[PDB]
Symmetry: C5
């Protein structure tokens, strides 16, 4: 079966149609070739034979001075935007400006929604983890944070790609003049409007990137604080265990003294009880004295 | 209800007025459009139809060759600066230079105050934490440090945005000539003065950024030193606990020897006390000898 | 023995030949010198006397307006690509475009295969390690991850070299015109096609580099999470050991009390059993009371 | 009281004078304004009305085609350099070259002295800390290292500022021609000499920055090595404590066996001593056998 | 004593001479001044009065259209290269190309030898350390690794300096034309050959820098893996010690029960042996039951 594109076409007035067209017929209808409608890059903006070709992560659009086309829209939840919002936006400037503005606004809104969803989850997770009232932390939250950080890195990469793609065009005036496809097809400055649009969208992308960077540095700082808190708790626990070990060692020393003195033989002291009381008191007090001296030795350190 | 701007207007002589004006009426009065007075960016400097538009984090100003306007000043604690200082500053160069200088000076002073407030708190907290006389540290101070670091990152982002916005204009002479709105409206070099102003403010922002970077690297170094101190304390505590365990093990070994020799049976040695004294001395001395040998074994490591 | 190149030659029609030729004879046949056919760089693209010289990590190609040559193809598993695919690709544009496209596509496919092989192994290893259900992790997996990370770094370096080499040419139009060797040899725009090819391959390389960077940051985050999990497990284990030590210390204290009271002498209390029961109950209950108080003391911390 | 500058003036022949002059009188004497002699930047180099203005961290100089002036030299330990060295340096090229060379050489020598003082202290401290023969390290040395690192960061910032300030001028020829104040005041190439001077000083600053970067990376590596050594010592100590605990557990198990067999009741075995000897030997040997088996179990791990 | 240079002179034919010449006489013989032959930079390439001046870390060369001079060659192990190899290299292009190629090749070979010596030592040390079969690692190897890393950082700095110095010249055509000293002294393109030489050497330096960067990242990854392995071993050791402590606590609890029941008083149970056997079995079994329950409690965590 020959390959076919699932195309949806928008007119200047906002009329909407949808069908499936073979690639060869689509090439013949336009002045393009299969070399162009390949979509080998994640993000791309290009001009060929007075036809604009734009592609995003999952969006593919072709702009013509009299119509717009979107390709491969199936199973992408684009129906609400396609059949409810885009016609309203497209309904004195040429069609190209409106189409470009609509597509860029859609992409920017998608990125903004992604960031707004990501931010509160990470903030809440970090606030919960940083709680210094617990000597341990959960791990499902750690896994969630790892996944959200991976998503944040992907979002940052996408934003950087968007910024680079826009900047590559904003630098050269040749591409800016090329985008004025209507002027060339059928010969107030278009260049100023295009520059304003691109600058606005680039600034928005820059703001999003700055926010993402702030979030990442916050994550790193939270990780460091968590490490410090865990280390402090470890040190406190070891101090307590050490002190108890000191007391136990002294107590066991005196207990050995007592039991060894309690040999199951003849010592010639079995006829005196005052001696037994004296040795009992001796062990009981000496344990405390040695314990206090050893605590002082620990303290001097 | 139609949207309205809460506007305050300053004249050349310093006269001050304040009112509320609908957006459509404001557009009609000027030569601008709703496309411009949108304020979609955190920071922006632009020129349209010989009218300057400037925006900061929460400040919105429009400069006209004969007047200045500030929008959305309510609930922002700007009354003292608006009605007490700005008229004095505005009271031979055109109005645009004075207005731009006043606004830039206000922003720079705000950033300087933020940095001056942030610095001593972080310095004191780090000095308190680095104290090597304690095996543990507080956690409320850690939370305060985390919050202050987040604020520092935000301040650095704002400073970078300011620097980039100023540099984007300082590079091109077209925008510099555009800023001379009075010359174009009603046709000594203005460009030199504008360049001097922008360079001065850019240098101040660079100094602030350098200070913030120094603070951040200091924070990182303090964190590393804290980690090292905690590790050293842990090692010392483990050494002490180990030594006490060695002594306890030897002592318990000899105590087992004694108790096992003290079986509740007939051994045929119950008629000798010298033997009991000999075994008591044997355990008492051998404990010390084994303890010393084991300490030597630990030391050789 | 004079040095010789193992050369394989492809014609415009796709005809294939292979032989061995001495370096001096090869230089004489062409208009080049030994200074050029040295291959001292890992990656290189150059033009000399209307002859293109290209080199990769292990590939060496010379492009002539009427033929293509590949050098040192032995023991490199290139037979399948050389004798099965390249002739089909070479079978209206000149030969140079086809040859360059084929070689660049080969290199890009090799890099893509490398990355696709590397990704799943690292992902699976990290998923296995991050499992928070174990207090310890394997080490053979760690060694495998280290080796794969080294390979990833090498791949990133190669991708960066490719991007830099392509960009160095894309910037200057002189080299672009030079690549049109057929036009100069025997005097629609070639420059546009060359620019399109180079831009496409550069964008593909950029995508690969972005993917590698994402993988590296994921590795770092996984390492940090592993550290945190290990620290938490350590803290929990120390808490348990501490509590058991507290109980043991109290129990041993009361046991010492009992044994010391059980001296092998005359105390004048051997005629009372109620006293023995009372002391037994006293130790048994006091152990629990002291243990509970000490647990409360631990909890307050 | 009107503000006054403490000025010291150097003539072409090297004559030296010093006095205090009001700012208004100083402005009137020159062709400058208060806008210029403000000194709002840490480092600055500028030209105004054929007068050079230079400022460093604490140095302020004004160069005139016939004289040099230094401002605010009090309480700065500049007397030795001012009244002993500068006249000798100033005693065929114009005065501006000599003055600029002297000031730049002074600043470079100051930075070199700072770096030479900082280096040996850090090197010695790191060498002392890295000593792997100790399980713990001092903390006063850590504080000293932290302070020295802060100073190093400040020095790096100053060097970077110097480099940027020089480069900003070296790029544009307009400023280079402006620095030839004598030529403009009273109309062999001056530009070549200025370029040589600036390039030399920039290269020296670059060398200093490289040295500082090397020192910083050395510090980081030393920190990592310290962490590794502490971790290894911790592991060794825990191994020893574990082994001793294993032995103690076995010994206490057999001691419990013995004491429990030594109940203070009637067992019907009190008439046999061979049994007592057998049980004593049994415990004594079984302790060792269990200890060896448990050590083997530890080793297999 | 007046300063003197230890000079060695090479002629076009390869003739070699060596002597000592005073600086003033050397300046008079050439068209240079003491300002040039100062050698204040670690690396430098410059042209003055149709004379080339080049300096490396410890090499100082002056190129003249008819001769070459090397200064301060004593105590530097340069005899083998000076009197055995350089004449062969110098024996249709002018002398300058040969001299520059020889010097650059010497420097590149030195750097390559340094890197080739450094690599295997670091690789072997890291392979030995990463061995996960040991719970501890040596420290002399750590010191060796630290020293080798310092040397690697120095080598990277030198390579970067070389690259920057070459690039500074490759950018501007004025310096390229200046290097053609023979053409200017006594008026096929020299510029092409110079560009080829500089590009080749720059690419070689870039390859060396990439290799060094790969080595550094490998070192960092190895450090992280070492940390992880040590942490895992610590956790395993703590688990074992914890389990043994649990068993010991239960055993000591039951031993206390037994000894306390064995009071040296009258209990009225001394006439029953079945009771003694029952209590012995009770303690012996209950120890195991409690131990198993506590192990289950540990496992559930
Ligand atoms: Ca992606
Ligand atoms: Ca640690
Ligand atoms: Ca903000
Ligand atoms: Ca490689
Ligand atoms: Ca007894
Ligand atoms: Ca400073
Ligand atoms: Ca060096």
């Amino acid at each position: 079966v020959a390959p076919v594109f699932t195309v949806t076409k928008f007119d200047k007035q906002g009329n909407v149609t949808s069908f499936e067209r073979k690639k060869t017929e689509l090439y013949q209808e336009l002045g393009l070739q299969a070399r162009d409608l390949r979509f080998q890059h994640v993000m791309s903006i290009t001009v060929r034979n007075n036809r604009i070709i734009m592609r995003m992560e999952y969006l593919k659009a072709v702009i013509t001075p009299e119509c717009l086309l979107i390709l491969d829209y199936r199973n992408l939840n684009l129906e609400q935007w396609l059949f409810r919002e885009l016609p309203s936006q497209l309904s004195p400037l040429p069609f190209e400006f409106r189409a470009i503005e609509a597509l860029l606004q859609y992409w920017i809104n998608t990125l903004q929604g992604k960031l707004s969803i990501l931010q509160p989850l990470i903030l809440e997770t970090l606030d919960a983890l940083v709680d210094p009232k617990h000597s341990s932390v959960d791990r499902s939250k750690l896994h969630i944070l790892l996944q959200n950080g991976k998503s944040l890195s992907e979002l940052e990469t996408d934003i950087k790609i968007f910024k680079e793609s826009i900047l590559e065009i904003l630098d050269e005036e040749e591409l800016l003049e090329e985008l004025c496809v209507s002027k060339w097809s059928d010969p107030i400055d278009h260049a100023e409007e295009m520059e304003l649009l691109l600058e606005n969208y680039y600034r928005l992308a820059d703001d999003l990137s700055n926010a993402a960077r702030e979030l990442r540095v916050l994550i790193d700082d939270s990780q460091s604080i968590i490490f410090i808190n865990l280390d402090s708790h470890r040190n406190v626990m070891m101090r307590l265990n050490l002190q108890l070990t000191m007391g136990t060692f002294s107590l066991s020393l005196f207990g050995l003294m007592g039991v060894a003195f309690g040999m199951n033989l003849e010592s010639s002291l079995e006829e005196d009880h005052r001696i037994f009381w004296l040795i009992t008191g001796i062990m009981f007090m000496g344990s405390g004295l040695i314990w206090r001296r050893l605590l002082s030795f620990l303290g001097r350190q």
